Amino acid sequence: MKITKLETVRVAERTNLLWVLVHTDEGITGLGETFFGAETVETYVHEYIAPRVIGRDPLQIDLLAQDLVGYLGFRSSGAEVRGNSAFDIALWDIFGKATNQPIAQLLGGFSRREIRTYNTRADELAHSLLEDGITAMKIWPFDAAAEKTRGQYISMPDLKSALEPFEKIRKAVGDKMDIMVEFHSMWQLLPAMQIAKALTPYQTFWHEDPIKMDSLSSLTRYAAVSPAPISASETLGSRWAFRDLLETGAAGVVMLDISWCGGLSEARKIASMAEAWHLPVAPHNCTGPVVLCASTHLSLNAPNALVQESVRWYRDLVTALPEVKNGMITVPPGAGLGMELHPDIEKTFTVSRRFSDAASI
Amino acid sequence: MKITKLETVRVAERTNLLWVLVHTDEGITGLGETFFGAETVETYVHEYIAPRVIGRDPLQIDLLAQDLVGYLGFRSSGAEVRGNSAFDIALWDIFGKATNQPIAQLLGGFSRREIRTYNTRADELAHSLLEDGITAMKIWPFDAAAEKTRGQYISMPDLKSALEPFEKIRKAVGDKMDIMVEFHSMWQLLPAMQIAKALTPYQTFWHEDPIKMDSLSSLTRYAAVSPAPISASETLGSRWAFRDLLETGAAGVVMLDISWCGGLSEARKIASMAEAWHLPVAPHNCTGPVVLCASTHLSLNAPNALVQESVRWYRDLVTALPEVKNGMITVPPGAGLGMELHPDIEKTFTVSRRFSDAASI
Amino acid sequence: MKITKLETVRVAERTNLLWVLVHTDEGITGLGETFFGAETVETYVHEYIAPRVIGRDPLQIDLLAQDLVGYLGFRSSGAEVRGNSAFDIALWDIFGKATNQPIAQLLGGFSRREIRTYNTRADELAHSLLEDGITAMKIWPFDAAAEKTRGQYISMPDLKSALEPFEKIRKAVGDKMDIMVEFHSMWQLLPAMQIAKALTPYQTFWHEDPIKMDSLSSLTRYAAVSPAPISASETLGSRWAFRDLLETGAAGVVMLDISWCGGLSEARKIASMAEAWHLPVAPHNCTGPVVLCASTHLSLNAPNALVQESVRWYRDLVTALPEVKNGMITVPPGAGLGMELHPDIEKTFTVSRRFSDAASI
Amino acid sequence: MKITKLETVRVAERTNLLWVLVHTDEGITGLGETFFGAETVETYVHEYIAPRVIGRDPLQIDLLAQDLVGYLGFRSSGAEVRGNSAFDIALWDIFGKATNQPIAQLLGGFSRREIRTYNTRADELAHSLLEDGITAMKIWPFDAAAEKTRGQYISMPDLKSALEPFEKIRKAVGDKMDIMVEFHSMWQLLPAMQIAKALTPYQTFWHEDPIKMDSLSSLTRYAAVSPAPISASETLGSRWAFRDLLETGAAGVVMLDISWCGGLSEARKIASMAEAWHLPVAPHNCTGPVVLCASTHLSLNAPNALVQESVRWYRDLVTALPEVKNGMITVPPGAGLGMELHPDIEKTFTVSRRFSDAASI
Numbered sequence A, B, C, D: 001m002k003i004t005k006l007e008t009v010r011v012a013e014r015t016n017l018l019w020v021l022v023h024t025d026e027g028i029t030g031l032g033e034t035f036f037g038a039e040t041v042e043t044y045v046h047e048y049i050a051p052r053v054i055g056r057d058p059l060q061i062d063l064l065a066q067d068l069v070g071y072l073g074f075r076s077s078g079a080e081v082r083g084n085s086a087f088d089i090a091l092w093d094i095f096g097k098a099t100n101q102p103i104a105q106l107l108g109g110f111s112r113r114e115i116r117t118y119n120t121r122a123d124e125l126a127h128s129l130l131e132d133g134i135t136a137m138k139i140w141p142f143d144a145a146a147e148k149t150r151g152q153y154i155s156m157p158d159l160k161s162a163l164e165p166f167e168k169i170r171k172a173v174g175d176k177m178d179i180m181v182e183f184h185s186m187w188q189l190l191p192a193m194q195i196a197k198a199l200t201p202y203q204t205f206w207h208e209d210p211i212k213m214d215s216l217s218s219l220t221r222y223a224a225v226s227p228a229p230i231s232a233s234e235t236l237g238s239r240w241a242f243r244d245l246l247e248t249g250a251a252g253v254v255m256l257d258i259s260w261c262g263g264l265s266e267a268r269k270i271a272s273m274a275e276a277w278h279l280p281v282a283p284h285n286c287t288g289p290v291v292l293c294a295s296t297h298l299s300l301n302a303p304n305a306l307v308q309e310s311v312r313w314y315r316d317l318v319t320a321l322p323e324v325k326n327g328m329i330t331v332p333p334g335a336g337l338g339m340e341l342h343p344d345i346e347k348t349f350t351v352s353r354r355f356s357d358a359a360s361i
């Protein structure tokens, strides 16, 4: 079969989301998705990807991934890579539909049928999560302090204030809840280290993106004082960035976002490499439903998948969703992703579509 | 003063080029430029930069550079960074116009009034260049071989064929010409090393982008066998990527493209850092006239600028150009860049413009 | 324009201070300043700088900095460098006056309009500072013990005595005050490490110059045990010394004194390099008013400036001073520094001046 | 005994030279010397050293060396260190006179009674030197090329021209002459490496100061390609700079100048440390007669002294000189240096003297 058209879809009600639909001459359409800079990525999909992939065999997934790597903008989570990643997800959806297999199977099998999930007044939230069988939560109480000083400094009183949610959670539920801390790369090295040390009494599970992930050797300074492993990083793209992270000797939980890192194609390889370092992987969500679903496929396959993040309107965008039951998530049934865009989407949302085909490229 | 409008300009006759014009409430308009993915970068300029910079003081150059660094797509030469870089160049143009000073002065002074240039049948070309006082030339005779095997392999007969231009140049002009070799990041490590060793007899000046610049630690393997210093890399963005390059201990000639690396703002800092390593800088051109001009300003200021690359239609795009005389290049006279878009541009070219202002963001 | 005369000024009432005035043929006079060895630096200014700079264009700042680097005495804070640094500050003052711009603007813009300051019975002092909105203080209670043994040893009773001010401050104001510790490079490695460990309970903010900064690799031993980041070092000169510091992997807060390190020219480059390491800069004062002012310009520009040290007679030396309001400091208004030597100086002080011109060199 | 007066002496006919005379209450006067910035160092001697040493016991040599180390300007060859070094040489002269022993004896004995020397149309010079029994010569034919480009670049034709003296020397005398190459720290890293490789055919003995000695880790890059050991460096001061050099793993011949590095006191310790690395020392001269003489004392004592550089008017400045016979140099006879300032100096030269005593400090 051959790719005939690239279709991009946006909704005015959710401006960060972009869907990429890959049509074929066999009537099999693949669905992909990415998040942030939707208009920019959309332009890229039609300007750059379309003339390179119209007429091509979509089953040559590894080759197509290689053919879209840019002279510029590689090893990053920039617009080009986000576009490439969304396209790659759609190719896996096509491959699944063509073989009548779930993506998890095509990755090498369901190593598990479901996986533990985590979600993002802290003590009441903690109680509520536990009762629903969820035993991990991620919070980011230092972001407000970071914005005040652009991450160069935190006063001890502001630090103490930001520790209060941890004390509240521990007072409420004790050791029953894993607490992950997200820093959103907002801090410079010294205050990051200061905050890390201060978190020691609270038995935190991981410290995610404690500094900007642009010179990874700096992470060794952080690992030397951090009471929790470094979680890094949804902001990194390609297996080459992850080689660099692993070679620091400071890597902990390996985080990636399949729509930001080069697709399921790069993600599956990053995961197998992380396993060689005896480290786990945790694919990023809380963006769109397709990324949640495709990430769940990866998490059911990868032997070193630790947890699959999930959201505590998705139902109006797509035909089916991953299901969460007693704190565990699994994929919707069926070939490929196990979902498509909802038929009623243009009546619930304000939809814009753009097409490329043989005539337009 | 305050930024009032962002204007982007493209020409159908040169699809890779994008101009960014920053208008102010004082009637001072700054001109910036970047290359590759013009439509994509244009979308980004209006989607991301405009709502962040309309109403802002353009003289806070370092702050504006900081404020545009993305959560994703940083430390790269991707679309976001290219947009940011073009914008940054325009800010320097404004700063120059507001102070009635050339950009080279605002960077810290004219450390030289002109700088040596280089240009990209090889023996006849060499003779011709020398007669015009140009004593360096850059060639890329291995690219065809790379495309054949996607850079995994080169046969000895193909290697021998690609060495012929070097033999021709040396036979014609002997030691009078520096020969730079560009590889365009097309090769994997092993054939790159094989080619490097084979170039030994030809006394090459630098070996530019011999492999992909995505895991820089691999450059140590190359430096161990290369008869010429590594030139790297116009494909790298931000001073953080250049910190990583310098820390390999394999850095040679530090190459950057001001419109791909974060602007004059990041470029000037990369250059001063390279000097701390006793290494030179060589700003990339042969793209558009504004990048050539702004690069020349940087090259006249930076004490460690080694050469300024130049082209052997520019005249119809802008009002003035850098001048080359006896193999040396200098800036056009005047404040800022010393150039603006040509008044007659819409009659020579097929021009498209897009605007953002307070009403549209 | 061209430099016509170099003028040096000293006052008998403040023997450590030296001013350098750079006169031009356009009547624009630049003011610079340095501290320590005033007579020696003055001799150097006339013996070495004058014959090299009379007749030169002062706007070629980077070039003039390069031209004054000595065959001997480089990469240091010695007399030659102090002279060069004072001269460099005067060049920036000229550049500002010629363009009608504050120095902070010429460095790349006001990234902030004001910056947090710190000042040097400890509990009462702490209370007083907080009420004036100052939330950081620097103390050096170990110096007396160091002098007793030339820094080779501290008895446990003497250590305990030197910890008392920290206990007093914490008892009085708790976590509301950052406490910086200065050691003035008075200690050898082992007692420095012993003292560092003993400071753990007091949550110190930084440990400044804990040992002599002459073999920087020794700092790794200190960083391995110190509960606070290393602050280093006002005693280091040139970006090359700071490259060496950064490459230890033990660098913390990057301290410099613009009049000891090579001027605003070297300082601005040291700051941008430190940012590549995700570290902050803190320019040294409590010397003379011109250094305080020029340092404040740097601190308003450098995105990674953390704090600007200040004094808790300046008013009789110069025409205007940086202003402190609610613990924040900013520059005086106007082009260049925004200050000149006070017209009434020869009536408040015992003034000595020396001149070099075309006739004397 | 106690120091009573410090006397400095300069001659208008040799502006780079400075003598320091240390008078005592026992009538024993010590003679020291340094080179470069004579007026500046003279000011320092009276401003800084005098008030610290008048009234002190000159025999406490190690203690006095320690007491003069500056808060600023240490680990350098700057004015303060040059002053300290000249003073230290005078202390050794006093110690010698007080004990009726040559300085070489006080250092630990005459390990040799004489040492090989070297001197600085090349082929005719080589012949002449050999006939006088001198079998090493140092040349610096690359300096003119360095000045042209401030050390950033050398054209192949200029490189070829600078190699001609080596070809001339080898054609004339073959392998009979060791050829040392001095670069005077004039080159950046890349051209330094290029020049080093090009010198391979000429069997050079050492490559001295191939780059600036300000970030010594860069020397590893040079050592990886140099066909001769690195000679470094007369520009470095204190044993701490030499620790840094040794720790690079690239050190070769250890060069120092006793009047630039901290005196015989630091020099003797640098030499013993270099021996621990199985490396030789070569004390710098061709400055003044006192430095030549004191260096020769060091060279006769230090078991790892390799050669003592010498000049091919000294006789009118001092009472006695080191003697060269058949390419070997030895000290003049007598206690201390074995020389004093010539009695007739004020009639051959234009002499200026300055004094400090108990009344003036």
Ligand SMILES: [Cl-]
Binding pocket: A246, A249, A250, A251, A277
């Ligand atoms: Cl590891």
Ligand SMILES: [Cl-]
Binding pocket: B246, B249, B250, B251, B277, D218, D221
């Ligand atoms: Cl290096």
Ligand SMILES: [Cl-]
Binding pocket: A218, A221, C246, C249, C250, C251, C277
């Ligand atoms: Cl570090």
Ligand SMILES: [Cl-]
Binding pocket: D246, D249, D250, D251, D277
């Ligand atoms: Cl060694």
